[PDB]
């Protein structure tokens, strides 16, 4: 490798791991919105009975 290529390998290595966090961050936000909604939908149907 040359110095220009060696830096890119390290820089793109962190960017893959960095993009995994934002992919993981959405899952954490998406999951809690499901946990909120399932309680609301279960409560509404339990009321109709």
């Amino acid at each position: 490798s040359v110095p220009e290529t060696w830096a890119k390998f390290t820089d793109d290595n962190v960017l893959r791991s960095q993009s995994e966090r934002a992919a993981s961050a959405k899952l954490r936000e998406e999951t809690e919105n499901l946990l909120i909604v399932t309680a609301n939908e279960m409560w509404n149907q339990f009321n109709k009975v």
Partner: protein, 49 residues
């Protein structure tokens, strides 16, 4: 200087591996609450049947 660049690029790898550990303990939190989100739902189901 070639010692200097290896020290600079090591810190950014070292820094970015904080949030990778930090996100994983955050994801493991919601998974345990989701694993448990499944367990109590048998309650309302058992009273419905």
């Amino acid at each position: 200087e070639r010692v200097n660049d290896l020290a600079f690029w090591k810190s950014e790898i070292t820094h970015e591996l904080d949030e990778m550990i930090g996100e994983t303990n955050a994801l493991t939190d919601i998974k345990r609450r989701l694993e448990r989100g499944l367990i109590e739902t048998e309650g309302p189901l058992q009273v419905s049947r």
